[PDB]
Curated annotation (Swiss-Prot), chain A:
The keyword Ribonucleoprotein applies. The keyword Membrane does not apply. The chain holds residues 54 to 106 of 166 of the full protein. GO terms for biological process: cytoplasmic translation; negative regulation of neuron apoptotic process; ribosomal large subunit biogenesis. It comes from Drosophila melanogaster. Keywords: Ribonucleoprotein, Ribosomal protein. This is Large ribosomal subunit protein eL14. One of its GO terms (molecular function) is structural constituent of ribosome.
From Swiss-Prot, chain B:
Keywords: Ribonucleoprotein, Ribosomal protein. GO terms for cellular component: cytosolic large ribosomal subunit; cytosolic ribosome. One of its GO terms (biological process) is cytoplasmic translation. The keyword Transmembrane does not apply. The gene is RpL18A. It comes from Drosophila melanogaster (Fruit fly). SUPFAM superfamilies: RplX-like. This is Large ribosomal subunit protein eL20. InterPro entries: Ribosomal_eL20 (IPR028877), Ribosomal_eL20_dom (IPR023573), Ribosomal_eL20_eukaryotes (IPR021138). GO terms for molecular function: structural constituent of ribosome. Belongs to the eukaryotic ribosomal protein eL20 family. It holds the Pfam family Ribosomal_L18A.
Curated annotation (Swiss-Prot), chain E:
GO terms for cellular component: cytosolic large ribosomal subunit; cytosolic ribosome. Keywords: Cytoplasm, Ribonucleoprotein, Ribosomal protein. Its main location: cytoplasm. This is Large ribosomal subunit protein eL18. GO terms for molecular function: RNA binding; structural constituent of ribosome. It comes from the Eukaryota. Belongs to the eukaryotic ribosomal protein eL18 family. Signal peptide: none annotated. GO terms for biological process: cytoplasmic translation. It is found in: Cytoplasm.
UniProtKB/Swiss-Prot annotation, chain H:
Transmembrane segments: none annotated. PROSITE patterns: RIBOSOMAL_L32E. It comes from the Eukaryota. This is Large ribosomal subunit protein eL32.
Length: 53, 173, 226, 49, 63, 157, 228, 132
RNA sequence: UGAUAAAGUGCUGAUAGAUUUAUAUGAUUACAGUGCGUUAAUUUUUCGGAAUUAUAUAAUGGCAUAAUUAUCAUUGAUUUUUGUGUUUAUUAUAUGCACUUGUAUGAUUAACAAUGCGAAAGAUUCAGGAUACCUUCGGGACCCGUCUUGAAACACGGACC
RNA sequence: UUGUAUACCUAUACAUUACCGCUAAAGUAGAUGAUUUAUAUUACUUGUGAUAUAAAUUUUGAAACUUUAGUGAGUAGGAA
């Protein structure tokens, strides 16, 4: 139940959650992911999804 | 089921000739606490006298792994009954909880040695560090930085479409 | 004479609903005493366990009275010493439940009759739901549902002191001195079948599941059957 | 008491909107929030016995 | 399945005379009324003995 | 998070408002800044304003006895449990053809030249969206494979 | 005065009276006038009203009568509130998308096409033949005149001829099919109030004119994850 | 029609078919009328599946509507005119059926007298002779 | 964090069923609810509105002791029959008269609406019907009598009336 | 194949309900102005009771009606 993206942030292999949270922000991953080539494709199926009469 | 651990304590209920019997305790792995109070009695009948009816069960309480997201190697000292066969083993598993490694051992013995579970006595269960493990299928994972490309998914059956129009395609790029 | 019949049967009507209104008032002050007993009992055991941890001891809680005993298997291929315990427990049909006191004379009957039976230790909620929803009662050898407190009171108030339903829930749950009458007054509880069904029916509970002492998991199984 | 847990929830949620106080979504809220003045009497006027 | 209903589930008393004498069954009409409406066991003995046979109602002497 | 049981399925009743728990999205988000949630339960097929497709696949049976009062019906797009329960409650029909009346054009103008046997969906059958129906007469069995129609009424939402 | 108040009708086994309601009686006005009403009598001016005994020295008969009469109450509807664009699932206007106006005091639904768009009049639909869609037109001050209720268009009558009698009179019946002119008058009042508020928004395939195109269910569809 | 019973009940029949003697299809010497099979191996008698059913008493009719005709009424054979007058007081509960051997000459009085007494007959217009 | 437990917790959506000849020989019984009801304060949306507080008696809890009874362990803790006030909470009783389409109808199923008129002789509408069949289809399904531990038996008898 | 997980399907078993039987228990028998029920006059308690005048149900094949419970396999065989 996992599907792998192209992003690899950097933290130690035995890090706690605050080090992981610190590294998402420095990578600018939220701004990169929502404009990534087919996270766009995600939200068009989400738009197409169930679609009022 | 999933086999969480308990501490079952037992006495030998003290007829007045003897005051304050010596109180032995355990580490029982069991699906539920009704079956942990016949694993206490099975294991103690090897060790001290006092069966039930002639003993008591003082506090059986569940123990809740003390670091559920730390990642550690569990060595299990076992002994089982094969078809010709009482043996000892020392198996090593890699998990987060200690009831989850014991239950990863009760399947493995069933797979690899056919070991239906009434044959398995567990001696000890530890959290050995690393460079004390031996068990090459556990030492695979004792190296940062580990890579392995994946090939593993779900492939619904029939699907959200049984007669598909577009071919699942195990690969891309 | 009919000129005296309205004279007689209008005070026999006035006194009649003075009794019923009297016993409506007892059964609220009666069942409030009982319901406060159970709350103090539960907060006692919480208090005692939390004391014995701080006093660096153990608190072994009380071994249980009140089995609820269900017949789970068969009327075919049964041995005569286990056929006979199941007629002394009034367990003559599949999914028949009765209430049993746990003295040593009956545990060695619950061990004779073990593979045909499951038992365990009921809650208060399981005592109520079996007498509310499923509780029938025995009126001159006939089986009479409940539908009011007059079916319980008309047979157990001159001799014993049971008039309400919560009376009958009291001297069954807290095993009282008229438990012998409080549980032979009932019919055997003709329970349904579980929802989700069973586990194996011919292994012990502690093997992989069914017969014998489930012991606290008789509650979860009575939710399916009641 | 379940009807009293409701009023403490819809009051404490609506501190970001705090509109009314009249009849629509706050009849079952702000009426009983000001009927604690109707139990101001019970502490004040009942100590005459 | 339940248990187990041989006998004498069906009780083997009499509930009526075996007797087509009309003067005898008029006394059964009285004594069912008399037993039911006066619940004396005198009147239930007379009723139950009025059903009986020539054996079970033996003669009795004048002495 | 079962201490947050009131705030998992929480969006619309606080968007209504009925006692207002928490009106936050959980949307299978096309709005992308916090894109979450479970592209949950789909399986599309069509047919259907009235006359949603079912086929009478056979009676509701065990392997050697048949019980020809309930009837299993496979509906066109449904193949999980959530999908076959939409139709639960609703009214079904087996409509087919005969030739001869024993009736008149009292109503529309007929030789009574199309028959119908109505029924209800009572419940679901497996884990894949099959369903169980209970018609007024009984469904003759040469109806197996043929079209049953799931009328969208008695209409819930 | 007040404070009697049965406030059960939701909860309802904790039914909110009898911890309070008996606590207002200081023996208030223990009175009666209360006639033992002597109208029922064998009372004659000369009339001799007695009454009579017709056959109740009777028919030889348990003459046909059935048991007795428990009655209609609580009406509960789904959360469909006007003006939602419903979809008429059934009954002679099937497929057409109509607009809600109000509910009855019998749980029915008052719907117009409007008649200029759908050719669907002011008629009444059971909400078991309606899909209440997500398209709602805002009607922030619309009247819905209060003579529009259950006894309005409601059936009568077929006299079958003139109420003449039991003669067998020949063919050429024209029995009912009016509609009245006050029937026609009303959906000039509510449609002119609707065809201004329908048109009041930026248009789409219904929302300001095109509400005329009759829901059908095409290929690659559902009933069961179609958010209607 | 004529005087329908006394707020009639809806008759529920446990099964409508009748009972067919085992192997009565194989032989033209076996009537279909039910005989209990006594044979030691008989798969009907031993109640195997697929076979012809036996009449037990769970099939018995409701005691309210036992012997009620479809028209609501129990049946009463009528043999002459004075026997019809017994139904003067039973016409809310009984039909009347003229006995097969009552002639056409005398069946005319009986259908006459049973409009006056309002007896619903089961076979009116039988053995007429609908002429003069 | 989770697990176990309990509170008509509450809500939602369904399914199947609904004896009942209330006297072809015993009250439609009681309960409960709704309608006119001396007041006086205190609030409330402000509408015929609505809430609260104020009356005696009887309890029951929470609290503060003083007794008492009796026990795991006793620095104390649990417990039975009490007592009285300190007290702060909660239930019950004190709703009579007349009326009414509000429960058990003392196995309740009862209502709104659509279709269809049982025509003087004879149509039609709705529901039902293995009548002896025929048509169609799915499931079931060996041949009876018999002796036998065991019969469909490659045991015997029986071509048909 | 071994060890498990949920979710389903399936008896004539189990639960509820309708109906048949069997079993076991219980009720009912003033008919003459007997019993009720609704009104209509008086003794009186406020209210009830009694006299009177206004409609019915009941001659329960007493071997009949009415009420409630449980129950149901069967060769040889017995019995209604």
């Amino acid at each position: 139940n996992l599907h792998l993206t192209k992003y690899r942030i950097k933290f130690p292999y035995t890090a706690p959650t605050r080090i992981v949270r610190k590294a998402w922000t420095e990578s600018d991953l939220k701004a990169q992911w929502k404009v990534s080539p087919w996270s766009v494709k995600a939200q068009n199926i989400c738009k197409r999804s169930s679609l009022n009469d | 089921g999933l086999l969480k651990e308990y501490e079952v304590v037992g006495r030998k209920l003290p007829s007045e000739k003897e005051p304050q019997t010596p109180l032995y305790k355990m580490r029982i792995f069991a699906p539920d606490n009704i079956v942990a109070k016949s694993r206490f009695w099975y294991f103690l009948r090897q060790l001290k006298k006092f069966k039930k009816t002639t003993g008591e069960i003082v506090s059986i309480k569940q123990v809740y792994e003390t670091s559920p997201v730390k990642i550690k190697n569990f060595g299990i000292w076992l002994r089982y009954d094969s078809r010709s066969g009482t043996h000892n083993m020392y198996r090593e598993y890699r998990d987060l909880t200690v009831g989850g490694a014991v239950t990863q051992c009760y399947r493995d013995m069933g797979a690899r040695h056919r070991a239906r579970a009434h044959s398995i006595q567990i001696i000890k269960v530890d959290s050995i560090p690393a460079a004390k493990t031996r068990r090459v299928h556990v030492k695979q994972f004792h190296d940062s930085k580990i890579k392995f490309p994946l090939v593993q998914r779900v492939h619904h059956k029939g699907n959200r479409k049984l007669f598909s129009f577009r071919k699942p395609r195990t690969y891309f790029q | 004479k009919q000129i005296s019949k309205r004279v007689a049967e209008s005070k026999r009507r006035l006194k009649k609903a003075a009794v019923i209104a009297l016993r409506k008032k007892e059964n609220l002050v009666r069942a409030e005493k009982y319901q406060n007993e159970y709350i103090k009992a539960e907060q006692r055991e919480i208090k005692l366990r939390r004391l014995a941890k701080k006093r660096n001891q153990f608190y072994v809680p009380a071994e249980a009275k009140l089995a609820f005993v269900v017949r789970i298997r068969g009327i075919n291929k049964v041995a005569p010493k286990v056929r006979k315990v199941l007629q002394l427990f009034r367990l003559r049909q599949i999914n028949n439940g009765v209430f049993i006191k746990l003295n040593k004379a009956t545990i060695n009957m619950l061990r004779i009759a073990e593979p045909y039976i499951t038992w365990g230790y009921p809650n208060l909620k399981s005592v109520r739901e079996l007498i509310y929803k499923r509780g029938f009662v025995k009126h001159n050898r006939q089986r009479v549902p409940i539908t009011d407190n007059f079916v319980i009171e008309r047979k157990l108030r001159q001799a014993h002191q049971i008039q309400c339903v919560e009376d009958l829930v009291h001297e069954i749950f807290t095993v009282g001195p008229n438990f012998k009458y409080a549980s032979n007054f009932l019919w055997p509880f003709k329970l349904n079948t579980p929802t989700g069904g069973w586990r194996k029916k011919a292994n012990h509970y502690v093997n992989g599941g069914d017969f014998g002492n489930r012991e606290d998991q008789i509650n979860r199984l009575l939710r399916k059957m009641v | 008491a379940a009807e009293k847990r409701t009023v403490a929830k819809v009051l404490a949620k609506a501190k970001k909107q705090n509109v009314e106080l009249a009849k629509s979504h706050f009849a079952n809220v702000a009426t009983k929030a000001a009927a604690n003045r109707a139990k101001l009497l019970a502490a004040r006027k009942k100590k005459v016995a | 399945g339940i248990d187990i209903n041989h006998k004498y589930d069906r009780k083997v008393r009499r509930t009526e005379p075996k007797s087509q004498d009309v003067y005898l069954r008029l006394l059964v009409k009285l004594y069912r009324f008399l037993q039911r409406r006066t619940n004396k066991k005198f009147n239930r003995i007379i009723l139950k003995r009025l059903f009986m046979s020539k054996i079970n109602r033996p003669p009795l002497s004048l002495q | 998070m079962a201490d947050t049981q009131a705030k998992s399925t929480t969006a619309p009743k606080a968007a209504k408002a009925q006692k207002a728990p928490k009106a936050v999205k959980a949307p299978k988000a096309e709005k992308p800044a916090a894109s979450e949630a479970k592209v949950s339960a789909k399986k599309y097929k069509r047919h259907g304003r009235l006359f949603a497709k079912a086929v009478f696949t056979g009676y509701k049976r065990g392997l050697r006895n048949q019980h020809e009062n309930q009837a299993i019906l496979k509906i066109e797009g449904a193949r999980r449990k959530e999908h076959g329960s939409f139709y639960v409650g609703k009214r079904c029909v087996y409509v087919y053809k005969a030739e001869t009346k024993k009736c008149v054009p009292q109503h529309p103008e007929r030789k009574t030249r199309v028959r119908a046997v109505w029924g209800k969906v009572t419940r679901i059958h497996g884990n894949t969206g099959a369903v169980r129906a209970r018609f007024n007469r009984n469904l003759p069995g040469h109806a197996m494979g043929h079209r049953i129609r799931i009328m969208l009424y008695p209409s819930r939402i | 005065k007040g404070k009697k108040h049965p406030v059960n009708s939701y909860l309802k086994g904790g039914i909110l009276r009898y911890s309070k309601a008996q606590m207002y009686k200081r023996r208030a006005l223990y009175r009666l006038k209360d006639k033992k009403s002597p109208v029922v009598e064998k009372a004659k001016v000369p009339i001799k009203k007695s009454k009579a005994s017709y056959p109740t020295k009777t028919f030889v008969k348990k003459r046909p009568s059935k048991a007795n009469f428990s009655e209609h109450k609580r009406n509960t509807r789904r959360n469909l509130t006007p003006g939602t664009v419903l979809i008429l699932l059934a009954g002679r206007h099937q497929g057409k998308r109509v607009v809600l106006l109000k509910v009855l005091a019998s749980g029915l639904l008052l719907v117009t096409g409007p008649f200029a768009l759908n050719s669907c009049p002011l008629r009444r639909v059971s909400q078991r033949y309606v899909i209440g869609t997500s398209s709602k037109v805002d009607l922030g001050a619309f009247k819905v005149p209060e003579h529009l209720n259950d006894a309005y268009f409601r059936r009568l009558k077929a006299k079958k001829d003139k109420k003449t009698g039991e003669a067998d009179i020949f063919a050429a019946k024209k029995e009912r099919f009016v509609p009245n002119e006050q029937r026609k008058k009303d959906q000039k009042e509510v449609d002119a109030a609707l065809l201004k508020v329908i048109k009041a928004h930026p248009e789409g395939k219904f929302f300001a004119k095109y509400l005329q195109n009759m829901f059908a269910l095409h290929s690659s569809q559902y009933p069961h994850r179609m958010r209607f | 029609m004529t005087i329908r019973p006394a707020y009639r009940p809806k008759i529920v029949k446990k099964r409508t078919k009748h009972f067919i003697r085992h192997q009565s299809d194989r032989y033209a010497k076996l009537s279909h009328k039910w005989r209990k099979p006594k044979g030691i191996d008989n798969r009907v008698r031993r109640r195997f599946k697929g076979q012809y059913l036996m009449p037990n008493i769970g099939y018995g009719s409701n005691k309210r509507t036992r012997h009620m005709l479809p028209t609501g009424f129990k049946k009463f054979l009528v043999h002459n005119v004075r026997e019809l007058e017994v139904l003067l007081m039973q016409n809310r509960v009984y039909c009347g059926e003229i006995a097969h051997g009552v002639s056409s000459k005398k069946r005319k009085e009986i259908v006459e007298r049973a409009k006056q007494l309002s007896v619903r007959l089961t076979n009116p217009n039988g053995r007429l002779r609908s002429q003069e």
